[PDB]
Amino acid sequence: TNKVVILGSTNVDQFLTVERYAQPGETLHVEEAQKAFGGGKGANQAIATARMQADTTFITKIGTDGVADFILEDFKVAHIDTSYIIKTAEAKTGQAFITVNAEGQNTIYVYGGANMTMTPEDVINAKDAIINADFVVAQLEVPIPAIISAFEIAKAHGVTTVLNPAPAKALPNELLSLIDIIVPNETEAELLSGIKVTNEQSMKDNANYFLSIGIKTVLITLGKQGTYFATKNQSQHIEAYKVNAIDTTAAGDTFIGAFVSRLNKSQDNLADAIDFGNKASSLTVQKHGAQASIPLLEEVNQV
């Protein structure tokens, strides 16, 4: 079992299911109000690694509005150490506003909120967790200077750093040079390398860019096309299982959480860990069947 620290976002996702998206100036009518669910790349990845039974600690910053209190309960049920979660009155808890149509298209707006107020001092404050970790994992729903500071601590004490550079954005060298394992998707790879992902040769070209700037291990998630990885010594393309074209089930984050849960410190099992990650991820788009969702008394008593 790996010791894993996640540094990242917690969001309250507000879902409004419509039949058809309104158009500018229009007024449509909907059946239900917004339903709130737990979200955030950081929360997703934290719950994934923790459900994979990694020793998990989550450094995240929410507001003092209490809107993610139900998420905190889920963290506790998963045995995620919550000692380092920060609450601030500076901003409301991060939120996503997602309109789903009959087809299943997600249209999403993201409010950074408390997530984007996380500072290096918030991170320094949590250094004990980082120092004793095998891996620290970050995403870009939290500010770059916070991530740099966590990766400086990690790197200085021999702790492996892993960055999921999502959502896509430009990174400074100060950060790039601190990353041991980078895990973009095709779109994120091309924004960082300048090189589009198409044939296996472009994947090699991407990997070579990352290796040249000091990143030791490169994965490019390819969606239905699976996953590519490279080190100085290895280069492999691995097939996926069940995967939706658009991620709408936290499959990407589930892949990362599980990948990291399975990775040996030595990284001698890249392909095995990537396999396990792709397994975990497929379970998220998996149908359970009608009988399976026939409710229990307790659940109905709560309606």
Added chain:
Amino acid sequence: TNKVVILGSTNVDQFLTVERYAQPGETLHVEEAQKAFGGGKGANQAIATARMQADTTFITKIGTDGVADFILEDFKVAHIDTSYIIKTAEAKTGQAFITVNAEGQNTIYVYGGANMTMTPEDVINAKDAIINADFVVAQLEVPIPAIISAFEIAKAHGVTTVLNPAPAKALPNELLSLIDIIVPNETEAELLSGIKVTNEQSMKDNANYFLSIGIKTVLITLGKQGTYFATKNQSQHIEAYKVNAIDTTAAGDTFIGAFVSRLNKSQDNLADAIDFGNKASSLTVQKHGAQASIPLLEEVNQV
């Protein structure tokens, strides 16, 4: 807690998810093979009443092909008494072949199989369960002469009979005269009464038909429109909760299971029981959210 005997069908549902339905003579390509899930109105209603913690016994007839063995395990987990389940080499286990498209339309074919070989002697064989029950519930995925025989036993010993007359078909007086509670949908009501369900007056007219032929309690399920009920003394229209236009989550069967779990023998709580049934049913079309379906280690180890 009610003692409930369900008499009815067990099906293995084979789901093929396509993007678009092929047309006659066409050959389309699909991403996955058939996935098997538990089905059957009887199995659905049995698992519902049992998850509502009614004392449940299920009289059902499967084949000796073992294809529903996974369902039998689910029955056991739900604490359904399986002492009276029959296996026959006369026919393969009942099955449904369901093609889903991108939109979510279900196109279904039903193979009666072992379900439609159930005889009065199969039923007589299980009489102990019936005699000591508060309610016996049947559906029409099993043969009418089997249902008549179970309802004769029930009625003779003061046990309340409830028929969910689905799928729609004509019933003989020999059966009609044995039913204490009938629960059609709008389509089933009109096939039996000859009277279409439209305004509340047509519902009264339907009820009056059923009352006149000796059925003491009438419910007409109205889908999104909720549920209507009538006795000689009562007439009420009750609103539903969350309900899909087409039942695709065993919502109807879940309503019946829960309704019966909640009904007092005296039937003095028709509206309360119908409310509870509509609750249970709504939980079936309820979204759980991405984080909720992020898998556990055990589940991935099984992939």
